[PDB]
Amino acid sequence: GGSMKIKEVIVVEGKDDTAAIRRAVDADTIETNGAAVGAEVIERIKLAKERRGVIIFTDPDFPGEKIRRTIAEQVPGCKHAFLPREAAKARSGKGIGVEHASPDDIRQALANVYEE
């Protein structure tokens, strides 16, 4: 048994990121659908950050990192989750993307945001 529930809202790129996350944890997500984010979505992320915290979780390539840096600049105090080293490799599993990550690799990424 067992399950992991996430208090923070998880900010992700798209629908397949949300799907991979939901297969791993009980969590709410906000999808940016890219790095050109309107003020309305930024406002929703800011309100989530202030109320519950936010974890940004994007792909370890240039476009995913561009989303991450864009949100971090516009919403101070977001947390950041990263796939473990092995899962992030392009030659391990199905690739580098969050959308392709196994449930335990997503849980490890999220667990590593917390000090203890």
Side-chain angles (χ1 to χ4, degrees):
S3 73
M4 184 181 193
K5 186 171 201 274
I6 305 296
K7 169 179 179 177
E8 293 88 349
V9 176
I10 305 173
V11 169
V12 304
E13 182 180 349
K15 68 180 186 69
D16 299 320
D17 301 275
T18 291
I21 287 169
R22 315 256 180 188
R23 290 193 293 264
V25 297
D26 184 9
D28 289 304
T29 66
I30 290 168
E31 294 163 10
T32 66
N33 303 116
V37 183
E40 194 274 338
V41 183
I42 292 308
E43 192 56 31
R44 280 195 281 114
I45 298 170
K46 174 183 321 193
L47 298 174
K49 192 262 313 191
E50 288 169 7
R51 200 85 285 113
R52 305 162 56 165
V54 158
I55 296 166
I56 299 162
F57 193 12
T58 58
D59 286 351
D61 63 359
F62 185 93
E65 292 317 271
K66 176 65 174 181
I67 298 169
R68 179 183 303 282
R69 289 197 301 283
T70 296
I71 303 302
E73 186 191 344
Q74 299 181 256
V75 186
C78 288
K79 304 189 238 178
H80 292 273
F82 300 91
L83 287 176
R85 284 164 298 162
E86 182 76 10
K89 310 199 168 180
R91 274 110 150 170
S92 80
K94 188 149 202 255
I96 73 170
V98 174
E99 58 203 352
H100 300 303
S102 74
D104 43 311
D105 286 324
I106 287 175
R107 285 186 293 261
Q108 288 301 321
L110 296 170
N112 291 338
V113 175
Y114 306 108
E115 287 88 342
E116 63 185 10

